């Protein structure tokens, strides 16, 4: 490393995050090896980003979104329920505070934490209607990894949102504790509960 | 960052103008509990009485309280611009007052009664309980009572 000078002043930490390595906002992307396979090739890591904001267009084709960073997908899902439509900047700020919190608690990489939570809360089976017309039933089937991912993300976001609704605990910390409970496996997470529900129902309707 | 521990001289709900005012909330939004008193008037009077608005109502002195009362019930002597008032150029004497907890409703009743005995259109409308500001009555104010 060398601290360079320009006509306009650049801080040293940004110089380091420039030349020494490419971080997150302020975190690493390496040593975040996904644990469970079959989610690999569908979560986008090893292609770092400094912010989850990007004018990327993965909605033109079918399977493109797999190459979108999972954090951008999180920020994307966070802006919903009407008034929060758009306002991606706020979602990013919330992510940042959340990662700060998940680094002070459970001091491992918060990125590693959330990906382990995703891998944990992936609904492996799910029911669906099949029938010869009026003779139709809720047959249980296997879930795609992409659908596992999307369902997991939606569950996490909705759990945090419904927790932070009408009460003081912020959307950020709600999301944080939800991700933590999911990463561990706790049955207190909205996501984990829904997942166990679905898998039980799949078992029953085999 | 400043933290005064406390003293037990604090008080919960108090009384003034025949009104059970709630303490433990900031003075302005506390006072607005009173009928005939809004956020503007309250903030203004608490400014004029030289009060710290960061303070809570239940932790105060009766002197501050009564000075505020005096300013409330006699505004003009403390340099009020006379158009904040809820009742100015009143109806009879042309003097400008600021009606309060019970006087608000009493005067409202007096005005409605005046118009009714006058057999005015607005008075008849109020007497029947309908809408008066020229609104439509076809699709709204159905379960009005």
């Amino acid at each position: 490393f060398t601290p360079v000078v320009l006509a306009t002043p650049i801080p040293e930490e940004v110089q380091q995050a420039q030349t020494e390595i490419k971080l997150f906002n302020k975190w690493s992307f390496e040593e975040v090896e996904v644990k469970d396979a079959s989610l690999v090739d569908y979560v986008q890591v090893r292609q770092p980003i400094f912010v989850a904001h990007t004018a990327g267009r993965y909605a033109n084709k079918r399977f493109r979104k797999a190459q979108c960073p999972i954090i951008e997908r999180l920020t994307n899902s966070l802006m919903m329920n009407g008034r929060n439509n758009g306002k991606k900047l706020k979602a990013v700020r919330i992510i940042k505070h959340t990662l700060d919190i998940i680094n002070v608690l459970t001091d491992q990489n918060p990125i590693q934490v959330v990906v382990d939570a995703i891998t944990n809360t992936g609904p492996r089976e799910d029911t669906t209607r099949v029938g010869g017309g009026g003779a139709a039933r809720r047959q249980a089937v296997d879930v795609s990894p992409l659908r596992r991912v999307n369902q997991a993300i939606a569950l996490l976001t909705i759990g945090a949102r419904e927790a932070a609704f009408r009460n003081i605990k912020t959307i950020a910390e709600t999301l944080a504790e939800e991700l933590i409970n999911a990463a561990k496996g706790s049955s207190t997470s909205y996501a984990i509960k829904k997942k166990d529900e679905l898998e039980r129902v799949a078992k029953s309707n085999r | 960052s400043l933290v005064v521990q406390e003293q037990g001289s604090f008080q919960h709900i108090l009384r003034l103008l025949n009104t059970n005012v709630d303490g433990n909330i900031k003075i302005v939004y506390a006072l607005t509990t009173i009928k005939g008193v809004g956020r503007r008037y309250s903030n203004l009077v608490c400014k004029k009485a030289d009060v710290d608005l960061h303070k809570r109502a239940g932790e105060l002195t009766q002197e501050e309280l009564e000075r505020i009362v005096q300013i409330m019930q006699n505004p003009t002597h403390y340099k009020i611009p006379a158009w904040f008032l809820n009742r100015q150029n009143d109806i009879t004497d042309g003097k400008d007052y600021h009606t309060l907890a019970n006087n608000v409703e009493s005067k409202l009743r007096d005005d409605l009664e005046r118009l009714k005995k006058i057999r005015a259109h607005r008075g008849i409308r109020h007497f029947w309980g309908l809408r008066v500001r020229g609104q439509h009555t076809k699709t709204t104010g159905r379960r009005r009572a």
Partner: protein, 141 residues
């Protein structure tokens, strides 16, 4: 005279023109350095080319940007695209081609839009609805 160029980055409707020349490494935005944009995170988003290529390449050169149109985010994106374009054109004209092409390669490897503009344009508004595709609502009974 000076080895100097002028380029531009674009967005929905935000345009970021940028004069570039040889200098001492001052990087200004309509009156002011890069560090005073105040989305406070899109700041890092616009640092990105510098964070990719290292700041050493910016010592001998100065940039001056004028921006207009669109919202703050679109302005930022036009800014960074104009920046990368000016750097590339400079390395093309005055510097050899190897630096220019490896620079372009690194940029496109991190992200494509840093050099090329996204051709996504606002679709118009049609009658029978508030926006383009949305209609108002159907009432049967």
């Amino acid at each position: 005279a000076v080895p100097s160029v002028q380029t531009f980055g674009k967005k929905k409707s935000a345009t970021a023109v940028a004069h570039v020349k040889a200098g001492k490494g001052l990087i200004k935005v309509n009156g002011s350095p890069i560090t005073l944009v105040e989305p406070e995170i899109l700041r890092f988003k616009v640092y990105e080319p510098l964070l990719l290529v290292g700041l050493d390449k910016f010592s001998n050169i100065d940039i001056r940007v004028r921006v207009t149109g669109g919202g703050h985010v679109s302005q930022v994106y036009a800014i960074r695209q104009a920046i990368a374009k000016g750097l590339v054109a400079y390395h093309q004209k005055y510097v050899d081609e190897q630096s220019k092409n490896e620079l372009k390669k690194a940029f496109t490897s991190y992200d494509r839009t840093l050099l090329i503009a996204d051709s996504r344009r606002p679709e118009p508004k049609k009658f029978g609805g508030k926006g383009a595709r949305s209609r108002f609502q159907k009432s049967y009974r």
